Amino acid sequence: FNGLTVLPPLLTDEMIAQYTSALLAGTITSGWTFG
C-alpha cells in the first residue's frame, strides 16, 4: 500500500458472541425482568 491502513476494531468478535449469548440466556431464563 501507499499510506492506506486498516485499524482493527476494539471489540473482537468473541466478545460480541459473548454479549449475544448473555442476552439470549437472560431473555430465555428471566423473561423481560432482567431488562
Binding site: 500500500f1 501507499n2 492506506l4 468478535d13 460480541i16 458472541a17 449475544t20 442476552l23 439470549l24 431473555t27 423481560w32 432482567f34 431488562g35
Partner: protein
C-alpha cells in the same frame, strides 16, 4: 441452502472496497504533467520546472483525496443512522414485548432473538398468525327484559340457532350470562339490537 440473502453487508463491503480501489487507481494519472511518477520528474530535469510539474501532481491528488473524504463522511452518517435504528430495535423487541404494529415482525409480536454478523446484527422474530376463519352472524347488544346488555370483553356471535360470547382472536363460544355482560339503559336507541335471553 439459499444464498444472497445478506445483500446489505455485502453492499457495504463492496462500496468500501470500490472507494479504496478507485482512490489507489487515481495515482496513475498525468494531470497535465510530463509523467505520472515523481522520481522520473525529479531525475530527468532541472528544478525550476520540476516545481511546476510537482504542483500539477499535488493539486490533482489533493482533489482526489478531498472527494474520497467527503464520500466517507456521507457513508458514515448513513451507517450511524442505521446503527441507531438497530439499537432501538434491540432495546425494544428483545428486552420486552412490543405493541407498535409491524415494528419487528409481521403479525403479533411474541419475542425476538439476536445473532451476530461480521458487520451487523440479525433478529429472529417470533409471531402469532391466525388462520382457518369462519363466518358468523353478529349483533351489537342484547335486549332482555327491556334492558340492553353489552359484553365485558369479546363479541356476540350465532351459529344459526343460539347465541354465544367469544374472545375476538380465537373461537371459543360460551353461554351468555350476567357475569360476562353489563347493562346500560333500555333497548330503544341501539341500532341493530336483537332479542334473546
Amino acid at each position: 441452502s439459499t444464498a444472497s440473502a445478506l445483500g446489505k453487508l455485502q453492499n457495504v463491503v463492496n462500496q468500501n472496497a470500490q472507494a479504496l480501489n478507485t482512490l489507489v487507481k487515481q495515482l496513475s494519472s498525468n494531470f497535465g504533467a510530463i509523467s505520472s511518477v515523481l522520481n522520473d520528474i525529479l531525475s530527468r530535469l532541472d528544478p525550476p520546472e520540476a516545481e511546476v510539474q510537482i504542483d500539477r501532481l499535488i493539486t490533482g491528488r489533493l482533489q482526489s483525496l478531498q472527494t474520497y473524504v467527503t464520500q466517507q463522511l456521507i457513508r458514515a452518517a448513513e451507517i450511524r443512522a442505521s446503527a441507531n435504528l438497530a439499537a432501538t430495535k434491540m432495546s425494544e423487541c428483545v428486552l420486552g414485548q412490543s405493541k407498535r404494529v409491524d415494528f419487528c415482525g409481521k403479525g403479533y409480536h411474541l419475542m425476538s432473538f439476536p445473532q451476530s454478523a461480521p458487520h451487523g446484527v440479525v433478529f429472529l422474530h417470533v409471531t402469532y398468525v391466525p388462520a382457518q376463519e369462519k363466518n358468523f352472524t353478529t349483533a351489537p347488544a342484547i335486549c332482555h327484559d327491556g334492558k340492553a346488555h353489552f359484553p365485558r370483553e369479546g363479541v356476540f356471535v350465532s351459529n344459526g340457532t343460539h347465541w354465544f360470547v367469544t374472545q375476538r382472536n380465537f373461537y371459543e363460544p360460551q353461554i351468555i350470562t350476567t357475569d360476562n355482560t353489563f347493562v346500560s339503559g333500555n333497548c330503544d336507541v341501539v341500532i341493530g339490537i336483537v332479542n334473546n335471553t
